[PDB]
Design a protein around this nucleic acid. Sequence first.
DNA 1: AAGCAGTAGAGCATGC
DNA 2: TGCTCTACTGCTTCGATATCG
DNA 3: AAGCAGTAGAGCA
DNA 4: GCATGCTCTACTGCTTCGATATCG
Lengths: 359, 490, 122, 44, 305
Amino acid sequence: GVRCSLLRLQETLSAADRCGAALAGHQLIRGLGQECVLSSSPAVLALQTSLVFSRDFGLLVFVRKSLNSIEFRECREEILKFLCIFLEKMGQKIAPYSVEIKNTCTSVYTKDRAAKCKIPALDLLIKLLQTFRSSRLMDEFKIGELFSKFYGELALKKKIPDTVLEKVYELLGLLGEVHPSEMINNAENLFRAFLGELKTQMTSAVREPKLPVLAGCLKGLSSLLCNFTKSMEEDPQTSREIFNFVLKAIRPQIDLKRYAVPSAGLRLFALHASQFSTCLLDNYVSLFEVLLKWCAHTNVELKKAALSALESFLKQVSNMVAKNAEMHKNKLQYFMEQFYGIIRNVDSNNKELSIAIRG
Amino acid sequence: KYSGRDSLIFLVDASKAMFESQSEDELTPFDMSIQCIQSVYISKIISSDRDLLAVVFYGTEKDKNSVNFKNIYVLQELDNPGAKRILELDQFKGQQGQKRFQDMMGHGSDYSLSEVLWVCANLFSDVQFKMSHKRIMLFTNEDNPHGNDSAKASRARTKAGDLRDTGIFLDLMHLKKPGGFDISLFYRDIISSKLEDLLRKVRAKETRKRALSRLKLKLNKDIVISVGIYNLVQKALKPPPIKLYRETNEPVKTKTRTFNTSTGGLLLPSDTKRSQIYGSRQIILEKEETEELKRFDDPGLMLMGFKPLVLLKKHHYLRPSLFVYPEESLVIGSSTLFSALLIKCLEKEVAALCRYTPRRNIPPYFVALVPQEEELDDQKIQVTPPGFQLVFLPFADDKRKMPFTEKIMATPEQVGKMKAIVEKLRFTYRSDSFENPVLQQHFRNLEALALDLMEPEQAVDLTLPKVEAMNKRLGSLVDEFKELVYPPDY
Amino acid sequence: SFVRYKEVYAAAAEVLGLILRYVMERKNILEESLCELVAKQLKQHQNTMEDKFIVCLNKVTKSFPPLADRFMNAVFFLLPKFHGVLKTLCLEVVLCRVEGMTELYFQLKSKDFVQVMRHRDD
Amino acid sequence: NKAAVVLCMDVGFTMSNSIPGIESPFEQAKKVITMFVQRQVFAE
Amino acid sequence: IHWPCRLTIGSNLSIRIAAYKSILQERVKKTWTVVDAKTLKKEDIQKETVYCLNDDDETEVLKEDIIQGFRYGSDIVPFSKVDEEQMKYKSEGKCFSVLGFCKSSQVQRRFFMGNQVLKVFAARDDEAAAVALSSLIHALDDLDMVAIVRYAYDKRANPQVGVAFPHIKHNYECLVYVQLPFMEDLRQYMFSSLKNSKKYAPTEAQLNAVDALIDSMSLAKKDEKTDTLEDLFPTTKIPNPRFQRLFQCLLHRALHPREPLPPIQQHIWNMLNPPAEVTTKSQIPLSKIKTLFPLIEVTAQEIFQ
DNA sequence: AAGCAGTAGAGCATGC
DNA sequence: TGCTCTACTGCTTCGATATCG
DNA sequence: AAGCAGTAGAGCA
DNA sequence: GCATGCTCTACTGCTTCGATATCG
């Protein structure tokens, strides 16, 4: 029961016609993934933490010996989808078991060729760069090499089926966000590579829009905007360009179903709203129209992720209207009478007048 | 189906006498059958290399299978044809291979009956794929295997019908007791001779059926009909050169880059443009601009009126002509309009004219639709299926210009002599069999490299003439026709 | 045969099994005329549509035993090709007619009975 | 071979005729000679 | 440019014979060079290929230990370049010989499979070859006598079989030559029968509506009162509009160095459209077929704004 | 183009 | 004045590669 | 990528 | 009444595979 499953997972390799024993090992890994999440006691959980990692027999060395095998993918994928939950069942106490998880992520990504394997192999590394965002254990991961490799993987042939490109564009911004002690020099080119791709992907009258590449580039831009900011005091040109791109990505299309790029663009515009200083005082009417229209979208991850953008837009417009509150009389009167028009409208929504009370 | 593969089990009889020479000094049936099985594998490993093939012997001394019967022994299992498997198979040639077979498993035992077909059924069952055709080739000579028992006869004739119930078809390739067909016996229950077809004729072929495009035909602007544009001839050529490492012989996986703007570092497609140079000035565009400046339409077939089948010569063509068919998948009821239009164009001999755009961005091309009607007989000669043929057409800068200015007529004597020449050289053209020599030589070269039967067979140039036969077939009138009007005369 | 929605064909198989069971258990010469009719309708399935074949066959055989002796080779042929709940349906077919079969053990041995007996379903 | 072609063009008063309801002949003449000299530059 | 070779019936018919090409596909020779942005120069790009064996963490190799292998069943076999340079195929030079003949009209319309037409036609220089070939085609023309040819261009080209049809014109006498298929290039597969279907029998009033449609939509009228048919809309003299569109966009960007691409004119579409009289003739029976025949049944620019 | 696996936008059902 | 060699050179053609349904 | 005739600038009558 | 829990077609997309266009 305990660790005999691990040694027989090593033992289902050296035998010929590894098919039925592969299916039994697949059920074995499903059994381990059903066992170690069932634990309602931290003692056996912290026991199993060091139990699953020996240096001769275990799942990690099994992955390290499942390298030259075509059929062995529905089990390696199961281990890789399991470790995304193994770095969430506990908290931060899997800290000595982290650099080996990063090294098996890099190996299983760069050596494999199936897109059903490279996707959990990047979700795991993103979850691992998301847990240890503190100062510790961050030159213990070689972040100066991840940038070079995962930046050299976009200057070659077109083979990535764009779900991998979504994760690559997210990861190159998460690198610039956490531990920004290294890449305080190469982020000049990363903004060019974030901007030219979005220009090609959104402004071209050929070749109907690969959708999730947009969401990947927007979340990568959101993670990269911190610590390397381009506000409207040092470069109010690229900031105007970025605001024009997110302005295009918040234009309300009528018939659209898969909502991912509104949830990307609005959650980007919520955080770094202060970066766009003078390119915000003009389209305030139409911005309020599209924002208030998106407030009523009968969803669960669109209204709750756009109300943040409406809120931060209100907070950022008042602090700019207050400093020179002389010629803005029509602006303040229009906004106040819009708040009164909301509060006098007889409606039974609770989160459509708590945006007028705050205003 | 489309991804449906087909299987074949080769059942070999070695009971008492086929392992013997049958008191002959000419040809032994065991090595004959092994020759035929090896020939079938050699043909199908380059013709149809995804099907399923296996070999089973019955009646041998040993026994090995999945359920441990008696005197049933298999050698390979259901998979693709493999070079390792034919180099395992070819060890049973000659009397030396016969004695090697004897020490490997031994000939001669009490051969059973239909439970061998049960073992073939258990080979057909346990495969996780899709199966289209299930046939069993039986290599045997005995035409009455029930010389002593009726129970095994009844179980044979019952189990064969049971395998026929779930659709399995066996067909014994009959052997010969004196050399020809003389055992005129009554297998009118089991089964549903000529082995040169298993020998020779499938050295080069491939297997498929696909559609290549699914388009719409627009009559006016608003009355459209769905068609599929199939291919019929496609100019098959040799498979590509897979790259390999010299020492360890594994795939290489090369990768490409673009860089070096006198800075080192790297480059990207967003940092570059397209350009052209005309004398002095260069014009700079983008990749999307190059992509956009070739646009005229959306992909489809626009109607442009009907035409009589006289003006379009068959001298005018530019591409292998395709073949359109109607289907009731996109729009329901297009078979009615296509059958009606086909009948009317067929009786009044009128061809349609269309503008044709294949995919989402291609400049347009004028095509002409010509109908054709089906044929068949008792032998089911489906050489013509019904439907429309898409003759391509040139535009203006395809028809070139010849010097065109030479004219001298001829005297009315030579025409009858040349008529006699072509009537002496008059025969049917063909139905098939004009095979490609360079591709065929490459096929035989690749054949004799993974087997180390070294001797590279010289490819038979079937396209070549035979002038030493054609001189005598023509007759001694060459010099007569020479010195009639065109002497060399120094 | 209208094999598109779950509400129609499985229910048709179930009510047909009830009809066949009643007309067999009554003493009337009527059960041949529709027993062979649903037999032809079922034999029309097992070449191109096998999932609906095994579902309808299980539904008929759950209330009608002797419509398996004319199909018992087919379900044994179709046993090692299924992995989901359909394999449980095949075993539910084969359970009701082991009182009368002759060999049965070579057939179970060939179809890997000691590797379906040791799985983790219930 | 090495061609030396000469074009002659009229700019007479009727070349400056107005429309009879469709379009001018000057536009047609200039567009056609444009297409010819265009192709003869671009063929090099 | 010329093509002089020899047409030899049998063993000794040494006859000089010239060949010229005809209808083929057409492209423009000028390709699009790549240049770097914000410099507009060529030498600032260098493309490279690295044949790195990955398979693990990678190890890069040189371009000296690299071979060419083919596939066989389930394995890969060597004999890269030099062994096939030995065991290639040999063609002993150019050939224009005659295989046989065929009186039958079994060289039909759907089985040509070539990319050109070689209109072989004469020789020069004391034209005994020309009078011989004119007598040959004057034997071929008065019957359905096709001529099957084996032809090659140079020693490295693949050999061809093909048809040589007679061609009778006034200022020239010619013999066209088309390629033919070999029995690997051919394939044929089954298609169902449309006529004898008990599920899709049409109606004669529908068929007569189709007859009115083809009478209205027709393009050829037997004009000038001598029963010679003459059509409008000749789709064999229209210039290929694609390079003309390329030319006008090129001239636009040459003249105005900032203006974007202008959309196409109307003379191109009036060239590529059927005439007004056939649409006005066919306006009513197209409404008739639309009423009578039964119940039948975007890019990144527009998607956001 | 053919096939096939997957997940999400939505629909019924129950709660402090 | 008359003949000859050869030094590339356009005009081809297989063959390797990038894209699309 | 690789061979086949065109056409003139020296080497040789 | 807003918040959380099963569930049903079904839209997008990955993978192979054959044809086409382009360049050397």
